[PDB]
């Protein structure tokens, strides 16, 4: 009965982030993707965007939260995260929320390295390149590509 | 069927090694410690010390290794490794091998950040100070710290 | 006569922080606590220099006051020219290196840093404070004084 | 036919920055500074008084101009023939959130970036410290060269 | 005329290596690969020279020569006061940065960094041999012209 | 009767020692510089020559005093009296590796360590590269103080 929560705001979903969905779903029972909550697109866009992109993944679903992150991880049996990482002072930020969602919950966090070919990519960089015209198409899955030149127009 | 291998010299293994043992055994349905080989004690006094300290997880055990990591874990059904940071620069050292890792094996790494009580414990700086007298008890568990007194004398 | 200046905006003062004016008060004759003003947060400044008072009873070289402005300024003011501060992380440094220099570049005033204790190296008052208001429970990162207080505001 | 970019938006140009636009200008046939303006938010200088602190300081460096733009910094470099910006680095944190950049601009056109390790004597020095610094009377004369410092007191005052 | 120096040891170049390369040649109208002799490695000097040579056909502003001593050196009795290497990460930044800024005060020798493409982030030489020694595959690592003669020296 | 220990190998010491030699000075009663030995590796210079080089570039500070030692640097630092390391620290990489000391000698002795910034003008500085550079025939000689240098040229010849 294993099981992690991948949390976000995921405005929008990356294939960096779509990348640790399929590691996390690869090595853990049960996955839950955590939409956190105003960016580009709306709570349920965001989790329409993320659901089209991992539906080959039976293990895994998507859910919106609110409120303490530990506490929708406890609310749900779980008691682990599992979050990309791209450097260095990622690990150094986000050491810092792991530790304390240890201390005040009990739930531990798992850390994974973004795959080499995604190390640039961010949600708000894809957006602010898209923006001004810059093709991000190699970086986004192929609906969410569609939806973001939609909101651009 | 989850699983994950926690590998290292540990030359002792530490109460940081023993944390990150147990929270890897709490998510992963079976863990294998994989001690990695002339430091201070043999391949067989740090399994037998290791072995000692995790007696109360009973889906963890422990093995020796040689060549490359990844043969190792993929030798045993697995195709996950978790690891322990405590920086920062730990993050960017082991980021390079576990890119490496996944490309030539498919073999997947999750970091867990150190117990923030841990941050300045490692094998070297523990035997270093215990050399020249200082006490480093509470950084080791009880079995090893005896074993380690004794090779001092 | 030696001294050194604890600054910062402690809203609220952790029990990081209070390390950090002990580990000062230990090796400095003077120290004084600086509650730096800005354009703010949870507590007033009356209250975060009380709350530090309350938590520091036990350091008779250390004082509490408020200031604005320049912090060398109000270093050079008092006599002393001499910075404490926490770190936590590299990162820590590599931004508090900048200040550190520029300090002393402008004024003379020099900045010695003290690592964190293990156990609060996660622990920053914007990380205690929003915790808190989702119920989260950080009563073992703050001072006895200051988690009573927090309550209060919160509800 | 050699050449490089060196952008920024030099909310005032310091001594750092010059630095970096000497150094280029001595590796690359010619140098363009680009002052990146946002049109949505105005900072302390504008655009011309940005630019007249750069010449003014730069008048000894032949193949060096500048000009201003906005949008991609990609189709600035491209629309004029080049594709390699040239940046300051001051920290190992400098270098991964450029290189994030670095790594974009690389993909969306092609442009590639060289990045230089600051003077020793500027680790310190940002536009936005010596701001804050001057805003509160700290003397800040030594990290700005003379065609800014006078500008920026003004400006406060 | 700009040109500039990409010094390494090389043993073996790998395509992270040939990216700066590619990547230099495309700025400088000169460029020297100096593989730099020590005290040692798997490919002897020649070995790599001519691993690199067959790597690099393509460019034909860019030669490769051996080099031993102090690095400035070898730039400046060339004409040339620039060195150009890739940079895999933050700390790569740090210790680079040292060597950088020391041989720009004892020569005048200035040095230009470019990231490294993100697909070779984690390719090294010294992980690439030690990989290729227990039977692991490194060939989408390294160019075609070293994968082969890697094969010979562990056979 | 405050004090802290400045200690470090010092083969040779720098200029950027020397800086921290003389801030821990300004804000302490008493400084002890510590001469750290390693009994099973020479360094370049011999520790009378570490000894004689320090105190030669430390002589217009009445309140420094240099000694050596080996062991552990807590027990050097209680049998004095104090509790107090400084050191120097040049970038993040630095404070990480030196965190886990600092917390380290904490945990054992109680003995507490505070950090001070590098001067932006040696922060590239230290004893190793500065050998290294030396032996090549590059020229160092403004970066070591002049109770250094030349003795250094003579080790290398
Ligand atoms: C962090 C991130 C964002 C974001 O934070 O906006 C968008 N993608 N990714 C990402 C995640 C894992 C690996 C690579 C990239
Ligand atoms: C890395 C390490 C060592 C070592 O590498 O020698 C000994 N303990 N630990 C450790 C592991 C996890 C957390 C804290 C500390
Ligand atoms: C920096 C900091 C904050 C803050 O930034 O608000 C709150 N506590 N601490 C802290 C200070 C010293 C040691 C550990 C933690
Ligand atoms: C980055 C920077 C700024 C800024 O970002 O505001 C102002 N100066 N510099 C600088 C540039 C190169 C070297 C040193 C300093
Ligand atoms: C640094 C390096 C080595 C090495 O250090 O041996 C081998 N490849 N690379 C590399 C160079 C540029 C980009 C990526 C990787
Ligand atoms: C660390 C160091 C060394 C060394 O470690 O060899 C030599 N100088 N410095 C130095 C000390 C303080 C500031 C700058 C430089």
Redesign the interface.
């Known amino acids: 009965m294993?099981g992690?929560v991948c949390p976000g705001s995921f405005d929008p979903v990356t294939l960096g982030h779509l990348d640790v969905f399929e590691?996390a779903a690869?090595?853990?029972?049960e996955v839950i993707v955590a939409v956190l909550i105003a960016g580009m697109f709306t709570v349920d866009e965001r989790i329409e965007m993320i659901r089209e992109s991992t539906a080959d993944l039976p293990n895994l679903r998507v859910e919106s939260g609110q409120?303490?992150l530990?506490?929708f991880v406890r609310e749900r049996g779980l008691?682990?995260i599992?979050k990309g990482?791209?450097?260095?002072?990622?690990?150094?930020?986000?050491?810092?929320?792991?530790?304390?969602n240890?201390?005040?919950?009990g739930v531990?966090?798992?850390?994974?390295?973004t795959?080499?070919?995604?190390?640039?990519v961010?949600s708000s960089?894809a957006k602010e390149?898209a923006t001004?015209?810059?093709?991000?198409s190699?970086?986004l899955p192929a609906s969410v590509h569609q939806r973001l030149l939609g909101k651009l127009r």
């Open positions: 294993t992690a590691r690869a090595q853990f029972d409120g303490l530990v506490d008691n682990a599992v990482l791209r450097t260095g002072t990622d690990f150094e930020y986000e050491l810092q929320m792991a530790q304390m240890k201390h005040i919950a531990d966090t798992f850390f994974v390295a795959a080499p070919a995604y190390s640039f961010s960089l390149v001004y015209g810059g093709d991000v190699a970086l």
